[PDB]
Amino acid sequence: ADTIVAVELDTYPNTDIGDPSYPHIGIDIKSVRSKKTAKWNMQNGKVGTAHIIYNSVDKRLSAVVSYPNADSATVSYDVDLDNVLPEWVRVGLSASTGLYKETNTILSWSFTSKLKTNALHFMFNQFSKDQKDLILQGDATTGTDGNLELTRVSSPQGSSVGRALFYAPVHIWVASFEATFTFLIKSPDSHPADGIAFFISNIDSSIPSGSTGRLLGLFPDAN
Amino acid sequence: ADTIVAVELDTYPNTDIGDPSYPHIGIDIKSVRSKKTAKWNMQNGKVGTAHIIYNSVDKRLSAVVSYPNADSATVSYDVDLDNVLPEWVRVGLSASTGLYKETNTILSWSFTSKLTNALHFMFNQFSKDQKDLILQGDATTGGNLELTRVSSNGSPQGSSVGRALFYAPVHIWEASFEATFTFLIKSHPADGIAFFISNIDSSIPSGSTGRLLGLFPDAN
Ligand SMILES: CCN(CC)c1ccc2c(c1)Oc1cc(N(CC)CC)ccc1C2c1ccccc1C(=O)OCCOCCOCCn1cc(CO[C@H]2O[C@H](CO)[C@@H](O)[C@H](O)[C@H]2O)nn1
Ligand SMILES: CCN(CC)c1ccc2c(c1)Oc1cc(N(CC)CC)ccc1C2c1ccccc1C(=O)OCCOCCOCCn1cc(CO[C@H]2O[C@H](CO)[C@@H](O)[C@H](O)[C@H]2O)nn1
Ligand SMILES: [Ca+2]
Ligand SMILES: [Ca+2]
Ligand SMILES: [Ca+2]
Ligand SMILES: [Mn+2]
Ligand SMILES: [Mn+2]
């Protein structure tokens, strides 16, 4: 199986697999069952921003999600990436839908990593119809209104999964990275599902079979 | 396979499986490859003390090892016990030797856990038939607990593994705990002593002498 470190923006509580009873953001280390979560007052139809940061000095992964004019949701956790991830990885964005659904629209994505010094930076503020520096998996598509649609849209569809990975491998392991993305999750359902994640993976990571819904396109099961 | 959280006092560097290049203390969460380590200035033949603490407020596992009039060695790490361990556990001490060897002698051992429901035990002496301990492998009692095999002349043996678990199951989440032990390692020494928390049915995995400390079935 693939090795995954991720930050999830989990819009749909699946309390049967350990997710708190409310929308939450969490840090996922080799399992969909987050090591730590924070309540997320998710806003249907508004543009939100997510910011992820890591350094090898304190070796803590930290994330914050926000909308303009509202309090943000943060979470942080100890993790030594040398133990969890291979030395070279692939960075990406993942999303899914299940029974319930929502748009998983990405309007912008930036990433910076330094390994001290060698560095990689990319910034997307728009996405073209053939964005050759992204590897699109599953249902993900680019270029409709200049955005990245991680899951299928006609209006959002159910039982969809998709992801977009930066084309180049990244040398992940002082060592550090940051990622930022903007997203629009809209849904006609009064329950949106399921969510978006920023992830870091083995270079040859692919969508696990049966990873729609509560598995976010990241994991082959809920273990 | 068992589920293990442990504090290791690692006397022998196995750099081929990620242990730093010096004796160290480490926090192990479901792998012998420590999540975090600190350098440990181990003192051959001198009684040492280890203290381990955990609370569900900050959900951090901490540990300190020291000797009289020396600097201590300390390590801490975020651990959410609910998503690592089963709800009921046993607690114990484990040790091993390999191609290099040491005595792994425990002179006292205490433990406290609160959830209020509470459990506490304190051993400042061990008897020959210590009915509230489960002895696994080469471990023996009777006033000390000898985790690994010591011959009749008092010299340790290689290729040995042994554990002692408290007799009752322990309710570890539904939260805090503390453990202390004192030990005497005499010998290059190998391999170390751990305090661990396990599934209730845990037993020494086959082939877990040497670097695997009696805890883990492989070095994954
Ligand atoms: C009353 C509780 N709720 C409302 C939230 C509920 C909803 C749907 C079912 C529910 C229950 O129960 C079953 C049970 C089964 N069984 C087999 C005959 C008995 C277990 C078959 C299908 C469904 C279904 C079902 C019916 C029609 C079409 C599909 C299904 C269908 O998808 O159901 C999945 C199996 O649900 C079993 C019970 O799960 C707990 C309640 N529940 C169900 C769902 C819907 O989950 C699906 O969507 C989620 C959000 O997008 C994803 O996170 C998730 O990965 C995904 O499988 N959530 N909460
Ligand atoms: C730390 C220094 N290093 C790395 C360069 C090292 C490397 C090889 C040996 C080393 C030491 O020490 C011995 C000692 C012995 N003795 C006689 C039984 C004791 C003096 C025999 C073989 C070896 C060998 C040896 C030479 C050739 C072929 C095989 C081996 C040899 O050690 O074979 C056992 C399997 O080893 C594969 C190589 O492992 C990586 C390096 N390293 C360190 C050690 C000693 O390990 C053994 O003891 C440890 C301490 O109790 C245990 O933690 C551990 O589980 C255990 O396997 N092994 N290797
Ligand atoms: Ca969920
Ligand atoms: Ca090309
Ligand atoms: Ca070792
Ligand atoms: Mn979740
Ligand atoms: Mn070690």
From Swiss-Prot, chain B:
Chain positions recorded as Mn(2+) binding sites: 8, 10, 19, 24
Q: Which residues bind Ca(2+)?
A: 10, 12, 14, 19, 191
Gene Ontology MF terms in the entry = D-mannose binding; metal ion binding
State if Manganese is listed as a keyword.
yes
Q: Which residues bind a carbohydrate?
A: 99-100, 191, 211
Gene Ontology BP term (one): defense response
What does UniProt say on post-translational modification here? The mature chain consists of residues 164-281 followed by 30-148. To form a mature chain the precursor undergoes further post-translational modification after removal of the signal sequence; cleavage after Asn at positions 148, 163, and 281 is followed by transposition and ligation (By formation of a new peptide bond) of residues 164-281 and 30-148. This maturation (circular permutation) relies on the legumain AEP1 activity and leads to an increased stability of conA after heat stress and at various pH.
Keywords of this protein's UniProt record, alphabetized? Antiviral protein, Calcium, Glycoprotein, Lectin, Manganese, Mannose-binding, Metal-binding, Plant defense, Signal
Asked if the Swiss-Prot or TrEMBL record annotates the protein with the keyword Cytoplasm, the reply is no
Function, as annotated, reads: D-mannose specific lectin. Displays antiviral activity and therefore may contribute to defense against infections.
Oligomer status and interactors: Homotetramer.
Other facts noted in the record for this chain: Binds one manganese (or another transition metal) ion and one calcium ion. The metal ions are essential for the saccharide-binding and cell-agglutinating activities.
Protein family (similarity comment)? Belongs to the leguminous lectin family.
Report the protein name in the record.
Concanavalin-A
Task: Name the species this protein comes from.
Answer: Canavalia ensiformis (Jack bean)
